[PDB]
DNA sequence: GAATTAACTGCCCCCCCCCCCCCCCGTCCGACTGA
């Protein structure tokens with residue numbers, strides 16, 4: 001259906017037609033011996049066929065790194081960033097979340113993950129100059145009900161938080177109508193949702209941000225310590241699908257994760273009391289891994305809770321940390337607190 | 341790809357109205373399909389008839405079936421907040437205890453985790469005007485600590501019929517974790533026949549301390565607790581009831597703690613912390629007064645309040 | 660006396676800092692107090 005335009009000899013295309021090969025993806029799916037036995041023809045013509053199919057699929061532009069560096073507008077994924085709404089957090093993240101790959105947020109309960117997720121959901125609708133993407137967001141609740149009251153309070157207090165942006169266009173922004181909420185209850189339900197509903201929303205352009213309220217919640221209620229292989233298969237499939245969608249539509253994916261204690265009797269966590277859940281198979285699918293921690297009254301006997309946001313690993317970010325507080329306006333980082 | 345706003349005229353609209361919608365900030369069919377009706381009709385010169393017409397055009401043109409935050413808030417804004425019987429606690433919780441969510445109270449020993457449950461079991465039958473929920477109550481017991489004479493005192497305090505209150509509170513006793521989980525299917529069957537407004541489990545994690553013991557049985561215990569909490573969440577979401585559970589405490593016998601005022605943490609690990617929505621921490625006060633503190637909440641700040649346990653139930657500290 | 664089999668034990672190294680009280684068992688008398 002598509003290999004017809006390729007230059008070739010009639011014998012090989014007749015063999016392809018007799019062998020029921022549809023597109024270049026199908027022929028690249030099979031290997032050397034498989035194609036040789038299917039077409040029943042010599043090796044050099046198979047090599048020529050593979051070369052021609054590869055040249056058809058790709059291999060046109062010689063893209064150097066100067067084209068990546070200088071041409072800012074040609075490759076937004078390498079330069080454009082999604083701001084977190086607070087200058088201190090953006091400085092810690094050197095601009096914000098990347099537009100490609102998966103970003104993980106992990107921590108214990110009552111740490112402030114949902115507040116950051118809501119702030120990122122609101123912050124995506126700003127124009128590109130103000131650190132937004134001029135699009136909506138998708139929220140997938142996997143554990144419990146969505147906090148509508150807190151979202152309404154944040155929307156009401158939004159003019160107070162965005163002090164730098166002048167407020168003439170703030171009233172034009174319709175925050176409520178550009179946020180989509182979904183609910184799931186099983187691992188299979190979440191897989192079906194990400195397979196079917198999410199691409200429809202991203203392709204048509206309603207939203208350019210995907211948030212999962214708790215990826216670890218469905219997986220902790222089905223698989224025990226003796227069923228690691230099916231869980232690994234499901235995690236690999238979900239990660240592959242999410243990465244493919246994010247790369248295709250240039251939409252950041254933010255995943256919220258839970259933690260489990262060390263239970264001291266590796267992966268880089270030597271003296272840490274808690275570690276991200278879902279094992280190492282899930283950790284291989286991510287790009288930037290964060291961690292939000294709260295020191296309890298033992299260290300928080302000073303009057304107010306102590307919250308620190310830490311960077312665990314990233315291809316372009318040193319391991320750092322800062323501090324932040326949660327108020328009626330949102331999440332704000334404490335100035336002059338970044339650690340080196 | 342997205343369908344531009346320049347497609348509306350083929351569906352039965354003139355250039356003037358589609359332009360009027362275009363310069364209003366909207367630029368595609370997808371944006372206007374989910375747009376609120378009042379925000380669509382608040383523009384001067386826009387009639388409701390053509391608004392409904394263009395909404396129908398978008399609905400038959402735009403793939404519908406997607407929930408929106410404004411619709412989610414304006415569709416479920418009739419939630420109910422049951423009063424706890426104490427003005428200070430109602431003020432601290434901003435009206436009381438919400439429905440469709442799980443609220444847990446944890447504390448030590450003689451704190452008021454059962455008196456509060458009894459008071460809620462009584463007050464949940466009040467009319468919505470008086471601060472109730474206008475429904476029955478379900479009490480699942482695991483320690484054999486249910487006293488109807490405590491409900492009678494509250495029913496007399498609020499001027500309700502003594503016999504009627506004891507007829508609206510279904511009771512059940514659990515002897516193990518399997519029985520406790522199995523009772524939820526019967527609860528689901530019963531909640532269809534009538535209308536319920538509250539469900540009480542006391543205590544949720546009392547039996548797990550002794551049914552599974554040691555490091556070897558930790559994983560099975562955690563998974564069983566997670567499945568039980570998932571079933572509770574499903575029930576709360578489906579029937580729109582208020583689920584209140586109670587927890588216990590365990591000591592911290594290591595030297596990390598330094599404030600030395602008997603450090604203690606709730607049991608259950610991370611599953612019970614993540615599953616529940618609002619967590620309260622009750623501690624002993626001077627005399628019969630008690631102090632309630634918000635431990636975790638998605639839309640509330642941590643604070644403190646003082647109440648007391650009286651002959652008529654949970655109330656306010658006397659002067 | 661000895662070849663042969665059977666039963667009990669063992670697998671290991673990091674925390675050296677120091678605000679923090681909390682709900683009374685005080686021991687009891689002076690005086691208030693309302694009845």
Ligand SMILES: Nc1ncnc2c1ncn2[C@@H]1O[C@H](COP(=O)(O)OP(=O)(O)OP(=O)(O)O)[C@@H](O)[C@H]1O
Pocket residue numbers: 108109110111112113114115150213256326327328614635636637638639640641642
């Ligand atoms: N005005 C406020 N409104 C809401 N929360 C506030 C406010 N002030 C402080 N907070 C804090 O915000 C926190 C919210 O916790 P949050 O829901 O983010 O926790 P989480 O465990 O990360 O969430 P989830 O389990 O839903 O992922 C509370 O612990 C509360 O102390």
Ligand SMILES: Nc1ncnc2c1ncn2[C@@H]1O[C@H](COP(=O)(O)OP(=O)(O)OP(=O)(O)O)[C@@H](O)[C@H]1O
Pocket residue numbers: 447448449450451452453454455456483485628649650651
């Ligand atoms: N009629 C009453 N008048 C005054 N106080 C009362 C009355 N009945 C009970 N109390 C007090 O209320 C408290 C009851 O504690 P409660 O049964 O609520 O504890 P809990 O948290 O459920 O404990 P446990 O962990 O043993 O289940 C006690 O301190 C008791 O003195």
Ligand SMILES: [Ca+2]
Pocket residue numbers: 109110613614615616617618636
């Ligand atoms: Ca929670």
Ligand SMILES: [Mg+2]
Pocket residue numbers: 110111112113114115
């Ligand atoms: Mg949160």
Ligand SMILES: [Mg+2]
Pocket residue numbers: 453454485
């Ligand atoms: Mg009790």
